Design an enzyme around this catalytic site. Structure first.
Site, PDB file in Angstrom:
ATOM      1  N   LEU B   6       0.858  -1.174   0.000  1.00 42.05           N
ATOM      2  CA  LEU B   6       0.000   0.000   0.000  1.00 42.05           C
ATOM      3  C   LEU B   6       0.896   1.226   0.000  1.00 42.05           C
ATOM      4  O   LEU B   6       1.486   1.555  -1.046  1.00 42.05           O
ATOM      5  CB  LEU B   6      -0.976  -0.049   1.183  1.00 42.05           C
ATOM      6  CG  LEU B   6      -2.031  -1.157   1.146  1.00 42.05           C
ATOM      7  CD1 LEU B   6      -2.842  -1.170   2.432  1.00 42.05           C
ATOM      8  CD2 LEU B   6      -2.939  -0.991  -0.064  1.00 42.05           C
ATOM      9  N   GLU B   8       3.432   4.304   2.589  1.00 37.54           N
ATOM     10  CA  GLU B   8       4.340   4.462   3.720  1.00 37.54           C
ATOM     11  C   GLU B   8       3.620   5.090   4.906  1.00 37.54           C
ATOM     12  O   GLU B   8       2.457   4.771   5.174  1.00 37.54           O
ATOM     13  CB  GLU B   8       5.550   5.309   3.319  1.00 37.54           C
ATOM     14  CG  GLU B   8       6.435   4.667   2.262  1.00 37.54           C
ATOM     15  CD  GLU B   8       7.163   3.441   2.779  1.00 37.54           C
ATOM     16  OE1 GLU B   8       7.514   3.416   3.976  1.00 37.54           O
ATOM     17  OE2 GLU B   8       7.383   2.501   1.986  1.00 37.54           O
ATOM     18  N   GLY B   9       4.301   5.981   5.620  1.00 35.12           N
ATOM     19  CA  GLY B   9       3.695   6.632   6.765  1.00 35.12           C
ATOM     20  C   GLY B   9       4.706   7.499   7.488  1.00 35.12           C
ATOM     21  O   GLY B   9       5.750   7.850   6.935  1.00 35.12           O
ATOM     22  N   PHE B  11       6.164   6.794  10.823  1.00 35.96           N
ATOM     23  CA  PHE B  11       7.206   5.935  11.374  1.00 35.96           C
ATOM     24  C   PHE B  11       6.871   4.458  11.209  1.00 35.96           C
ATOM     25  O   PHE B  11       7.445   3.615  11.909  1.00 35.96           O
ATOM     26  CB  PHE B  11       7.449   6.260  12.850  1.00 35.96           C
ATOM     27  CG  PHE B  11       8.038   7.623  13.082  1.00 35.96           C
ATOM     28  CD1 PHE B  11       9.395   7.844  12.916  1.00 35.96           C
ATOM     29  CD2 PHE B  11       7.233   8.683  13.465  1.00 35.96           C
ATOM     30  CE1 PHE B  11       9.940   9.097  13.128  1.00 35.96           C
ATOM     31  CE2 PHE B  11       7.770   9.939  13.678  1.00 35.96           C
ATOM     32  CZ  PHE B  11       9.126  10.146  13.510  1.00 35.96           C
ATOM     33  N   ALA B  12       5.957   4.123  10.301  1.00 39.94           N
ATOM     34  CA  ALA B  12       5.564   2.739  10.074  1.00 39.94           C
ATOM     35  C   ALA B  12       5.050   2.597   8.651  1.00 39.94           C
ATOM     36  O   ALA B  12       4.242   3.413   8.198  1.00 39.94           O
ATOM     37  CB  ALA B  12       4.493   2.295  11.076  1.00 39.94           C
ATOM     38  N   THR B  13       5.518   1.564   7.954  1.00 39.03           N
ATOM     39  CA  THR B  13       5.104   1.302   6.582  1.00 39.03           C
ATOM     40  C   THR B  13       3.958   0.298   6.576  1.00 39.03           C
ATOM     41  O   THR B  13       4.073  -0.789   7.150  1.00 39.03           O
ATOM     42  CB  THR B  13       6.274   0.774   5.753  1.00 39.03           C
ATOM     43  OG1 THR B  13       7.339   1.734   5.760  1.00 39.03           O
ATOM     44  CG2 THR B  13       5.838   0.522   4.317  1.00 39.03           C
ATOM     45  N   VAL B  14       2.859   0.666   5.925  1.00 40.40           N
ATOM     46  CA  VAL B  14       1.675  -0.184   5.879  1.00 40.40           C
ATOM     47  C   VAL B  14       1.884  -1.281   4.843  1.00 40.40           C
ATOM     48  O   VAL B  14       2.257  -1.008   3.696  1.00 40.40           O
ATOM     49  CB  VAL B  14       0.421   0.647   5.561  1.00 40.40           C
ATOM     50  CG1 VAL B  14      -0.804  -0.250   5.474  1.00 40.40           C
ATOM     51  CG2 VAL B  14       0.224   1.733   6.608  1.00 40.40           C
ATOM     52  N   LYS B  29       1.706  -2.879   9.871  1.00 41.88           N
ATOM     53  CA  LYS B  29       2.420  -1.604   9.884  1.00 41.88           C
ATOM     54  C   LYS B  29       3.765  -1.838  10.570  1.00 41.88           C
ATOM     55  O   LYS B  29       3.881  -1.743  11.793  1.00 41.88           O
ATOM     56  CB  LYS B  29       1.606  -0.523  10.592  1.00 41.88           C
ATOM     57  CG  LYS B  29       0.349  -0.106   9.845  1.00 41.88           C
ATOM     58  CD  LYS B  29      -0.476   0.878  10.657  1.00 41.88           C
ATOM     59  CE  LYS B  29       0.204   2.237  10.734  1.00 41.88           C
ATOM     60  NZ  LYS B  29      -0.650   3.246  11.420  1.00 41.88           N
ATOM     61  N   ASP B 125      -2.590  12.123  19.064  1.00 39.93           N
ATOM     62  CA  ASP B 125      -2.085  11.935  17.710  1.00 39.93           C
ATOM     63  C   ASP B 125      -3.192  12.197  16.697  1.00 39.93           C
ATOM     64  O   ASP B 125      -3.561  11.308  15.924  1.00 39.93           O
ATOM     65  CB  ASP B 125      -1.521  10.522  17.537  1.00 39.93           C
ATOM     66  CG  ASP B 125      -0.655  10.385  16.298  1.00 39.93           C
ATOM     67  OD1 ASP B 125      -0.486  11.386  15.571  1.00 39.93           O
ATOM     68  OD2 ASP B 125      -0.142   9.273  16.052  1.00 39.93           O
TER      69      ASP B 125
END
Lengths: 51, 299, 171, 129, 276
Positions: B6, B8-9, B11-14, B29, B125
């Site tokens: 899918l 990025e993000g 601090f976590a890549t989906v 993630k 957040d």
């Protein structure tokens, strides 16, 4: 902070020197005799009491 | 078992990969962390209460949770799959229009924050994309990467956090104490974004964000928000008056103005929460919200 | 332009005018002294808003009066070069038009008047009408002009204006 | 020297708060209430009656909170304290009329956004009393 | 999380010692029934010496550690040995793993080298200490039974002080009643009152205990109401709980110096005997 690696650089440097002159004074038997004097003064203080 | 990729993000890549046993689609993630260093922190506990305590708390407006596994380096998250989010509705894609469907967004958002505030949990957040949408249209949150269990007293904590677009006025000056108004500030900001379909607060850092908010809402005076000059980190700006909120937004009824004004209050002690917001005159009228079947979905 | 800044002026009080409340005597005398005047730095003081702080009593030899450095915030009026405001026509003469903006007097020269609105000394009431009698600018009319040059003088400040500009006339 | 067209202001009148007709008329109205409901023993003067009548002659607002709302939308843009009072007291109608009164306004933002700004001013403008 | 009474904890930690003996005997390495192992009654001293040393490690931490951070690590050291023995896992790494895993969720600006740079040894020796924490960090998460609903008594302690400085105009000096009450909450932390009582009523007990010993005894405070008393609803179910908290503090046995030096010598023989 920042993950990955990076932090391995000054890892041992900060472990030796953490803070500039840490507050480590033995003013009262390792900072413990003053805690006993405050408890004794509360049990026998200036509190007005009946008879 | 990798299936599809899918995006990025922060601090976590989906990752869209089907997990084992459970036939439900899991959106992993993976958080980029370290393991090569010796005395390394590795995994951060900022999401430890998310993948361990969410299994007990059950709520429809809160995202779900199945299992959790990892080993310092790669911490694969196990969360349910979601269709689309909210940024795609406003940003770029402008074909998807929601005629009088914003009432269903704020109704299901305040219920999710009220359930977290009851268990002494703050969602520190808030950003215009965590409101994830599924196939049925159930409004759910994203991740709890910045949650914390608070209590009655309010002490000093972290600073310069949260997305700079949606920032509380008391957080930009670096105030040590805060409260419920932290999570209640971005509630009206998201509502202000779905109306005009434009960024309501297009600011930069903490210095530029103070200019955009004050020139539109106003400057907290002594009668409005007391205790302002006592804070060390303080800057002196212009005497900003206050632009009304019933002329900026075109499609906005009379009952909608009774909620936007209470959310953008500069006084955290006098700012409306979630219980008093659901009992207003906006969520009790003739135009009832949609359950989720008539809500359109992006391509 | 109407402004709102802080003003500081030394007010002298007579020794006999004291009374019971000394603070009330100084306040009542302030409104009947600084109001109606004009200065070259602040402007035409109309009225005093809210009294800020009042100083102590300074006594100097050779002067029996008492001084109180009273600090307050009063509104002023200082025209600038390039301000476009409205005016009220008071007198109409063949040499130039005489207009006044409140307590301020203006002036419009003959060269700043278009050739269409020519002075007509035939009729008794003086006015500036066109050839086809479209608009009539006579005494006690609401017009508009642009300030060309300001000047301060005791109280009645001067500010010459112009009329050749567009989007003027009877507003 | 001082110039209002090029925003050439001295060090004393650079960051000063500007006032309009209805604002001064509102503050002067409070002084009239102190002479009718109290009177005391001292009488005012003719200058106060001429100034109060001149402000109401060119006034266009009525409510207190309505006046402060007009001075709010004219501040978030790249303008000035002098240009704010010229676009709030006179109450311009069209977008081209606003630039005709301020020479330093043409060299700013385009007329696409200025038209939406004057919509709020004309809405709160009291047409009748 | 609270359980019930002291009798329940007497069987949870007792079954953890007998569970490890089933795997140590069926191997042919250690003779069954020998003084090499540790008795269940001897494990009480090990749970008190290392817990007191963990409190001193947090006091000299740089910078100023919050109050809720100190009490957070004390809840991880007690719930870990409820299903495991002290012989399979040495307390030297357990008390450092629980402390390292309790300084992030409270929103405190701290990094990895800041927490390591606190011992009194060589810098090279501190690198091996964290390498063994990773082997127990993942296991500590699974041993908590997915129970992280924790609340330290230092959080509601600031709420009762406001009610006394407002309703009582005389007691307007909270700094005097703060030092005499912080020592009482530290003595009760070494006992087993956290896993058997509500963390909301613990802060209320320290207020009445520190005030009765000073002379100022509030007689109308129990007749008032403060958010359902943060406990129950009846008045009879409030005095029987405060009397039981002070009994565990008076009956608290301090760690003897002649016993710690003996238990540590017998504990090292089990780790060096290849899983014993």
């Amino acid at each position: 902070h920042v993950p990955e690696l990076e932090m391995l650089g000054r890892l041992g440097y900060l472990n030796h020197v953490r803070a500039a002159s840490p507050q480590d004074l033995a003013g009262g038997y390792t900072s413990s005799l003053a805690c006993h004097r405050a408890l004794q003064d509360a049990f026998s203080g200036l509190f007005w009491q009946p008879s | 078992e990798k299936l599809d990729f899918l995006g990025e993000g922060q601090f976590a890549t989906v990752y869209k990969a089907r997990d084992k046993n459970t036939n439900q689609i899991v959106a992993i993630k993976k958080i980029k962390l370290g393991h090569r260093s010796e005395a390394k922190d590795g995994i951060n506990r900022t999401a430890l209460r998310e993948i361990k305590l969410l299994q007990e708390l059950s709520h429809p407006n809160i995202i779900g949770l199945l299992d959790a596994f990892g080993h310092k380096s790669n911490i694969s998250l196990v969360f349910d799959f979601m269709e689309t989010d909210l940024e795609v509705i406003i940003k770029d894609n402008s074909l998807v229009l929601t005629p009088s469907h914003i009432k269903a967004y704020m109704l299901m958002t305040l219920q999710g924050l009220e359930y977290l505030h009851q268990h002494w949990i703050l969602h520190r957040d808030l950003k215009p994309n965590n409101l994830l949408l599924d196939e049925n249209g159930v409004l759910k949150l994203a991740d709890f990467g910045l949650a914390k269990s608070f209590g009655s007293p309010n002490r000093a904590y972290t600073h310069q956090v949260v997305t700079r677009w949606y920032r509380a006025p008391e957080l930009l000056f670096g105030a040590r104490m805060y409260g419920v108004g932290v999570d209640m500030w971005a509630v009206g900001c998201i509502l202000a974004e779905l109306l005009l379909r434009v960024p309501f607060l297009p600011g930069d850092s903490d210095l530029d964000q103070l200019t955009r908010i004050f020139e539109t809402l106003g400057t907290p005076t002594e009668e409005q928000w007391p205790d302002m000059c006592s804070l060390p980190d303080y800057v002196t700006f212009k005497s900003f008056p206050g632009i009304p909120l019933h002329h900026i937004f075109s499609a906005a009824g009379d009952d909608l103005l009774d909620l936007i004004q209470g959310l953008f209050l500069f006084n955290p002690c006098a700012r409306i929460t979630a219980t008093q917001a659901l009992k207003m005159k906006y969520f009790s009228n003739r135009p009832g919200p949609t359950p989720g079947c008539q809500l359109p979905r992006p391509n | 332009m109407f402004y709102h800044i802080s003003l500081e002026h030394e007010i002298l009080l007579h020794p006999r005018y004291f009374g019971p409340n000394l603070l009330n005597t100084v306040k009542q005398k302030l409104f009947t002294e600084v109001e109606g005047t004009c200065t070259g730095k602040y402007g035409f003081v109309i009225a005093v808003t809210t009294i800020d702080n009042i100083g102590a009593g300074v006594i100097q030899p050779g002067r029996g009066f008492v001084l109180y450095p009273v600090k307050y915030k009063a509104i002023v009026f200082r025209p600038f070069k390039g301000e476009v405001v409205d005016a009220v026509v008071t007198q109409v003469n063949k040499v130039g038009l005489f207009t006044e903006i409140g307590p301020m007097s203006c002036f419009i020269s003959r060269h700043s008047i278009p050739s269409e609105m020519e002075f007509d000394p035939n009729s008794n009431p003086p006015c500036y009408k066109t050839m086809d009698e479209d608009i009539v600018i006579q005494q006690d009319d609401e017009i508009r002009l642009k300030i060309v040059g300001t000047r301060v003088d005791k109280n009645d400040i001067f500010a010459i204006g112009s009329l050749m500009d567009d989007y003027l006339g009877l507003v | 020297e001082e110039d209002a067209s090029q925003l050439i202001f001295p060090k004393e009148f650079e960051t000063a708060e500007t006032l309009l007709n209805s604002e001064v008329h509102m503050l002067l109205e409070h002084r009239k209430q102190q002479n009718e409901s109290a009177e005391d023993e001292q009488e005012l003067s003719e200058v106060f009656m001429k100034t109060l009548n001149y402000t109401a002659r060119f006034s266009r607002f009525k409510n207190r909170e309505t006046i402060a709302s007009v001075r709010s939308l004219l501040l978030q843009k790249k303008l000035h304290k002098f240009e704010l009072a010229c676009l709030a007291n006179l109450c311009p109608e069209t977008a081209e009329e606003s630039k005709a009164l301020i020479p330093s306004l043409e060299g700013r933002f385009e007329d696409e956004e200025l038209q939406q700004i004057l919509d709020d001013i004309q809405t709160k403008r009291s047409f009748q009393y | 999380w609270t359980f019930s009474s002291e009798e329940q904890l007497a069987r949870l930690r007792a079954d953890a010692n007998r569970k490890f003996r089933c795997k140590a005997v069926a191997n042919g390495k250690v003779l069954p029934n020998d003084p090499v192992f540790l008795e269940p009654h001897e494990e009480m001293t090990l749970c008190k010496y290392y817990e007191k040393r963990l409190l001193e490690f947090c006091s000299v931490f740089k910078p100023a550690m919050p109050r809720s951070v100190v009490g957070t690590a004390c809840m991880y050291f007690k719930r870990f040995y409820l299903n495991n023995s002290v012989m399979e896992y040495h307390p030297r790494i357990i008390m450092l793993t629980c402390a390292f895993l309790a300084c992030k969720v409270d929103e405190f600006n701290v990094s990895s080298p800041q927490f390591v740079g606190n011992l009194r040894e060589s810098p090279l020796g501190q690198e091996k200490a964290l390498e063994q924490i990773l082997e127990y960090e993942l296991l500590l998460i699974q041993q908590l039974n997915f129970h992280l609903i924790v609340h330290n008594p230092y959080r509601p302690f600031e709420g009762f002080l406001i009610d006394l400085k407002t309703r009582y105009p005389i007691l307007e000096n909270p700094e005097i009643l703060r030092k005499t009450a912080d020592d009482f909450l530290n003595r009760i932390a070494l006992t087993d009152a956290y896993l058997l009582y509500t963390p909301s009523q613990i802060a209320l007990t320290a207020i009445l205990s520190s005030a009765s010993r000073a002379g100022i005894t509030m007689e109308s405070y129990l007749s008032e109401s403060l958010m359902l008393k943060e406990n129950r609803t009846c008045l009879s179910q409030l005095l029987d709980i405060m009397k039981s908290m002070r009994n565990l503090v008076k009956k608290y046995e301090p760690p003897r110096s002649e016993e710690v030096a003996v238990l540590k010598q017998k504990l090292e023989r089990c780790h060096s005997a290849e899983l014993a």
